[PDB]
Design a protein around this ligand. Structure first.
Ligand SMILES: *[C@@H]1O[C@H](CO)[C@@H](O)[C@H](O)[C@H]1NC(C)=O
Ligand SMILES: *[C@@H]1O[C@H](CO)[C@@H](O)[C@H](O)[C@H]1NC(C)=O
Ligand SMILES: *[C@@H]1O[C@H](CO)[C@@H](O)[C@H](O)[C@H]1NC(C)=O
Ligand SMILES: *[C@@H]1O[C@H](CO)[C@@H](O)[C@H](O)[C@H]1NC(C)=O
Ligand SMILES: *[C@@H]1O[C@H](CO)[C@@H](O)[C@H](O)[C@H]1NC(C)=O
Ligand SMILES: *[C@H]1O[C@H](CO)[C@@H](O)[C@H](O)[C@H]1NC(C)=O
Length: 435
């Protein structure tokens, strides 16, 4: 179901509609030109930003789901139709960790990164950082395994030293971490994303709850419970087999139309939680943006947001000339980063009542942007067509044309023009409002 090149392609009418719980699926050529290296161009630098792989529910969500399944099984006097499996379903999911499928996603992502950037990778040991979350670190280790596997299979490789994760950035409300938000006090107290999600759920869940209650006589569901049951489709799928080759029985409880609503609910939560819908959302991505500018320009970091001055000032933890960089992070931080970079500046504020597709939102959705095992590639290339280095952004294989600069038909801008266009991030944006 899941391949190195294309990601997850089984049951696409369901599995691509789980938002941030969708396994990565390649968006090569989707509302986009090809992501292929253009003729007479050579990559000179690549930065990868990768999410962790598919996982179990967090400890708190796992507790909630188990509580619900138990209550259903205790209250239902019958389990009718498609809900029949809940009579004997046994809740066995863990908490927080990668599933085997999620580990393999990341091995696959490392293989794909080697293959895509083979010309550089043959001689380069990438510089790698990970946010201080066990599933993120584990994802980094699996990416490295895949990278090394592909490199060993390539007779043309000259430097096969394994890259280490050189920096693990602590996750703490008082540690400045560009790969995991937490220090912007006002933002961390924001309820907007949760309120938008709740309001939208109140629109679509009632009909679903009625149908489920009809097929589970004795059971009373809330809106929240409907969403929990829908969440279980993805979580159970990515857990129950090592290759996620069997759709969970939870999945067929809901229609394709309902999956499109669920997918949009997830898009709303990320947009209004972490993206441009949140007044301090894109500010959470400024620190990484300034780190990326430092790498692109081989220059010291200039930032006063979520960088740590000790970490960025030491070559051992922030080398300025490493040619390949790979950073491991989380959905929410990656959404903020993509918005801070201006990559979704063609997306209008999402309707809170009407479902708009990624097609109609200029390529923005949770499933297109931060699926499980999400990856972004930020390239510099030197092309014979242009004296100046050109930058290109690929998000889950889709070329995401740059904003703020004079963008060409291939989605690229000249390096200095791109950096100039990131004036908001370079100034620190509205970070002062944090406090
Ligand atoms: C910056 O990193 C240093 C070295 O790890 C650490 O001692 C310090 O507390 C960090 N400060 C912040 C605010 O992240
Ligand atoms: C939720 O809906 C209520 C009633 O329609 C509305 O007043 C409120 O603004 C909504 N919340 C958000 C953040 O959209
Ligand atoms: C199960 O029944 C109990 C006791 O009436 C009730 O409080 C609870 O909400 C019910 N839960 C479900 C999921 O039906
Ligand atoms: C951490 O970030 C805050 C601004 O958010 C800044 O005041 C402080 O200097 C930073 N500390 C370090 C060590 O970078
Ligand atoms: C993206 O749009 C926002 C809001 O208009 C603006 O502040 C920011 O500078 C834009 N980014 C780029 C890179 O053009
Ligand atoms: C590049 O130079 C940096 C100093 O900015 C140094 O720490 C490191 O040896 C180099 N980067 C690599 C090869 O990881």
């Amino acid at each position: 179901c899941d391949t190195v090149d294309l990601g997850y392609q089984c049951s696409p009418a369901t599995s691509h509609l789980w938002g941030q719980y969708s396994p990565f699926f390649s968006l090569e050529d989707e509302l986009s030109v090809s992501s292929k290296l253009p003729k007479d161009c050579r990559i000179t630098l690549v930065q990868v930003l990768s999410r962790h792989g598919a996982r179990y529910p967090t400890s708190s969500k796992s507790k909630k789901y188990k509580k619900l399944v138990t209550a259903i099984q205790a209250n239902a006097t019958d389990f009718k139709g498609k809900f029949a499996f809940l009579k004997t379903y046994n809740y066995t999911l863990g908490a927080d960790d990668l599933t085997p499928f999620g580990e393999q996603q990341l091995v696959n992502s490392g293989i794909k990164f080697y293959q895509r950037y083979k010309a550089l990778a043959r001689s380069v040991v990438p510089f790698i950082r990970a946010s201080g979350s066990d599933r993120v670190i584990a994802s980094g280790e699996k990416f490295i395994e895949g990278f090394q596997q592909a490199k060993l299979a390539d007779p043309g490789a000259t430097n096969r030293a394994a890259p280490a994760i050189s920096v693990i950035i602590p996750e703490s409300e008082t540690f400045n971490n560009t790969l995991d938000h937490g220090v912007c006090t006002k933002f961390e107290a924001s309820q907007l994303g949760d309120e938008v999600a709740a309001n939208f759920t109140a629109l679509f869940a009632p009909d679903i709850r009625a149908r489920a209650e009809k097929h589970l006589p004795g059971v009373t569901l809330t809106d929240e419970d409907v969403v929990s049951l829908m969440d279980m489709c993805s979580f159970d799928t990515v857990a129950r087999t090592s290759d996620a080759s069997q759709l969970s029985p939870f999945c067929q409880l809901f229609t394709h139309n309902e999956w499109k609503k669920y997918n949009y609910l997830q898009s709303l939560g990320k947009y209004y939680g972490y993206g441009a819908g949140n007044p301090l959302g894109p500010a959470q991505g400024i620190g990484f943006t300034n780190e990326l500018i430092a790498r692109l320009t081989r220059s010291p970091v200039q930032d006063h947001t979520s960088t740590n001055s000790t970490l960025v000032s030491n070559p051992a933890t922030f080398p300025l000339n490493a040619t390949m960089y790979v950073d491991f992070s989380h959905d929410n931080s990656m959404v903020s980063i993509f918005f801070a970079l201006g990559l979704y500046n063609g997306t209008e504020p999402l309707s809170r009542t009407s479902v708009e597709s990624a097609k109609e939102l200029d390529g923005y959705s949770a499933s297109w942007v931060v699926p499980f095992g999400a990856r972004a590639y930020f390239e510099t290339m030197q092309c014979k067509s242009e004296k100046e280095p050109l930058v290109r952004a690929l998000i889950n294989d889709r070329v995401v044309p740059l904003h703020g600069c004079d963008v060409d038909k291939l989605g690229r801008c000249k390096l200095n023009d791109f950096v100039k266009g990131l004036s908001w991030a370079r100034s620190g944006g509205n970070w002062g409002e944090c406090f």
